Ligand binder design. Sequence first.
Ligand SMILES: C[C@H](NC(=O)CCC(=O)c1cccs1)c1cccnc1
Ligand SMILES: C[C@H](NC(=O)CCC(=O)c1cccs1)c1cccnc1
Ligand SMILES: [Ca+2]
Length: 223
Amino acid sequence: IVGGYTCGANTVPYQVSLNSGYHFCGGSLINSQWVVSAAHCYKSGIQVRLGEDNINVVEGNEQFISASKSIVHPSYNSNTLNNDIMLIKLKSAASLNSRVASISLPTSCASAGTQCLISGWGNTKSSGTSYPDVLKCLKAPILSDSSCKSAYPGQITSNMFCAGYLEGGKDSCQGDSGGPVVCSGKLQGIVSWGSGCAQKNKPGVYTKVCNYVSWIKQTIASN
Ligand SMILES: C[C@H](NC(=O)CCC(=O)c1cccs1)c1cccnc1
Ligand SMILES: C[C@H](NC(=O)CCC(=O)c1cccs1)c1cccnc1
Ligand SMILES: [Ca+2]
């Protein structure tokens, strides 16, 4: 996250870190045994880390649970990034508490102008690289479809939305992918892609979770 703030320990209780020897992506806990992330975060050997603040220090609220299965969306296209969503099942259910909690799926799609919370452990620099150890947060509005398409001609599908600031300076970045965009207490987006980070006229692009609620519910119900 570039241009954000320190969230505070466990103030984003649905945020997970995906670890394969190291943090590589975020995710969102949506019930005691399932996480939503980005399809482009797929790999084998995932351990889900819940209750994290500093990802390099055991602070006492973590739960580390290996994945039993991952399910990439059937229509994910890694070239276009359309349908950039996957589900990860935990081998055992997380113990839910105030610091490890699921986030509700949306009942409706959020509109341009809605203010949301984006979070992650990604790079905090638009030029160069610095990672944080603690979770970072950014408040940002959803942008209109027309301004998103104007920013990225020929690239924005009906399964994507932009959020952030056309002036630049505040954005998601490398290592935030797969993490949450939460608006009014519902998971509306997944950190997906952009052109660099925090550049002028290049806001972050996010998977539009409301389009996937049926797929998520039906997949969970049979897996
Ligand atoms: C205490 C604060 N609560 C809110 O911001 C609620 C309201 C909220 O999410 C948003 C308002 C505008 C965009 S998003 C908080 C908690 C955790 C992390 N950072 C801040
Ligand atoms: C630049 C960064 N990531 C991407 O644009 C997608 C990266 C991508 O598809 C892949 C990486 C490895 C295999 S596939 C980003 C993230 C969030 C906001 N702004 C920029
Ligand atoms: Ca930790």
